[PDB]
Structure 1
Amino acid sequence: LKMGELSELLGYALKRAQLRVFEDFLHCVAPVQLTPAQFSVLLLLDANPGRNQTEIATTLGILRPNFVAMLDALEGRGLCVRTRSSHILMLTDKGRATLARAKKLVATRHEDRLTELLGRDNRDALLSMLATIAREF
């Protein structure tokens, strides 16, 4: 195939890089069936006790309908609950076990292998120029 002027677009490579990383993420954290978003959601609810849904969603760039959909299924699966009695969620013991198991899988097979592929200096380079993009573009 003639890929033409797609090979000249940073937009394109970023999007294919993003997709590949996701597919690997998923394959690694398939013992616990978390998507990268469910992962980031459980991680932020654990690390931030006493903060409403408003703040998790907007921080991960997730839209309010979509976020409410997400939680409902996290709740459905038994990984979070609302405080009792609410708009503050808390994980459950299973939630923390799913999160801990997932940081394990994420760090071991996935992130390290990714890191070796490029080395520290370039991984660190990439984290930088990606962060500059989301913040400043």
Structure 2
Amino acid sequence: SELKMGELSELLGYALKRAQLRVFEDFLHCVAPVQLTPAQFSVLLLLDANPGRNQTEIATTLGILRPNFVAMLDALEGRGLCVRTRSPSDRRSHILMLTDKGRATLARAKKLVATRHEDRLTELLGRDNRDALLSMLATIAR
């Protein structure tokens, strides 16, 4: 009455998706007090590390295509978490910077991520094992 998972247990791609989907699902739950998807979260994180960059640069480093990034920024900018300002140098581009509200929302989101989510992962595995997992996934992506 339970099905045999056959050779699927040994396909690494398969393990990654179902591993990715629960981690993302858990991310949405833990972080729901600030209402940020993982994509929105990373956009705030990248904006925080690299102030002064433009849409093309932020979107590419994240793997987001620029036609799909426009709608994401409208959400965050509509919620008053970041600003598009025209660069005086080259008025084709929008330089992107965080608001104070954005910096606060990034701050508390960072806590719910570390305390409720990322730390709950680190204890279910080795603190060293989780770093090895993170290293390998980083290697796989290159």
Q: One fold, TM greater than 0.5?
A: yes
Q: 1 CA distance for matches of 2:65 and 2:93?
A: 19
Structure 1 residue matching 2:138: 3-state secondary structure = helix
Q: 2:55–2:93: 8 Å Cα contact kept in structure 1?
A: no
Count of residues in Structure 1 that have an aligned counterpart in Structure 2: 135
User: What's the offset of the Cα at 1:86?
Assistant: 5.1
Q: Equivalent residue of 2:141, what SS?
A: helix
Residue 123 (structure 2) aligns with: 116
Structure 2 equivalent of residue 43 of structure 1? 45
Task: Select between 54-63 and 36-45 the one with higher mean Cα deviation.
Answer: 54-63
- Does 2:15 match 1:8? no
TM-score, normalization: structure 1? 0.91
Specify the alignment match of 1:72 in structure 2: 74
* 59-68 or 85-94, which deviates more: 85-94
Where does the alignment leave 5 or more consecutive residues of structure 1 unmatched? none
- 1:3-47: CA deviations, max 9, x gaps? 333222100001111111111111011000101110000111122
Choose 17-26 or 44-53, whichever is displaced more: 44-53
State the secondary structure of the residue aligned to 1:61: coil
Q: C-alpha distance in 1, partners of 2:111/2:128?
A: 23
Q: For 1:115 and 1:85, how far apart are their aligned partners in 2? A: 44
Structure with greater helix share of residues:
1
Q: CA deviation at 1:110?
A: 0.5
Residues in 2 aligned to 1:5 and 1:47: alpha-carbon distance in whole angstroms: 42
| In 2, Cα distance between equivalents of 1:104 and 1:67 | 26
Once the two structures are superposed, residues 72-104 of structure 1 have per-residue CA deviations (whole angstroms, 9 ceiling, x without a partner) of 111111111112995111111111111001001
Percent identical among aligned pairs is 99
Alignment check: 8 A CA contact 2:54 2:93 kept: no
Distance 2:138 2:124 in 1: 20
The whole-number CA distance in structure 2 between the counterparts of 1:85 and 1:10 is 44
After alignment, is 99-108 or 78-87 more displaced?
78-87
Moved over 6 A (4+): none
Q: Secondary structure at the match of 1:88?
A: strand
Name the Cα RMSD after superposition: 1.8
Q: CA deviation at 1:2?
A: 3.5
Query: What's the CA shift for 1:63?
Result: 1.4
Structure 2 spans left out of the alignment, 5+ residues: 86-90
